[PDB]
Design a protein around this ligand. Sequence first.
Ligand SMILES: C[C@@](C#N)(COCc1ccccc1)NC(=O)[C@H](CC1CCCCC1)NC(=O)N1CCOCC1
Length: 217
Amino acid sequence: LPDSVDWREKGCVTEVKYQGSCGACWAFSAVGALEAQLKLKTGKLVSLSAQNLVDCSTEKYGNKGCNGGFMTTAFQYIIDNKGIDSDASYPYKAMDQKCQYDSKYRAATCSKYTELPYGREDVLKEAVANKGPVSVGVDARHPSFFLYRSGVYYEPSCTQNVNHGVLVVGYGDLNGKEYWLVKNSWGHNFGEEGYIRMARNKGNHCGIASFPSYPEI
Ligand SMILES: C[C@@](C#N)(COCc1ccccc1)NC(=O)[C@H](CC1CCCCC1)NC(=O)N1CCOCC1
């Protein structure tokens, strides 16, 4: 496997989004993963509608919109629905709205998704290298997480009790510290222009490899 990977260098990652006061991290995590697959398949990089997921992949999928959801059930919604609209056609309002999906604005489809084995960072590395960005959940409730600015994030108080959906778009080594390159959805003001390098091969730090999954087209 390559020593380092950065899907941003392959034009497979869209701009960092700002979720605001709506707990739609799971939706942003899901579309980010599909966006990479879409690019890989069609050659075009297009942001997908996180709102579409918020408004439509709901109760039947065990999701609660601005109050939380799952990346895997979101993927299944896209599969069941036969598509997801583009972010441009169905803009993010950081609010729970009535489902307004319209296939005339479909920008991607999904045929299946895969959930990686719990806590295996070697398997996650392989997926990130061979398949593309992977949706994951991390424990982001520690004060240090919000204040992250640079370097490789390592928080002794972190746990494998995950609560925030984000996206791994690569991995590498910085000054002797292995890391996972994570795309967040708290805008460009957060961390490194919206990204955070989280400790890798440090005993599944913050549960990063606890619940990984990726979709395919
Ligand atoms: C709302 C949230 C998103 N957005 C942020 O959580 C609160 C929070 C606040 C600040 C910093 C970190 C986390 N999380 C979710 O949507 C998480 C994502 C999920 C991803 C897979 C692994 C488990 C976690 N889901 C979630 O909270 N629910 C799942 C569905 O029922 C409702 C609750």
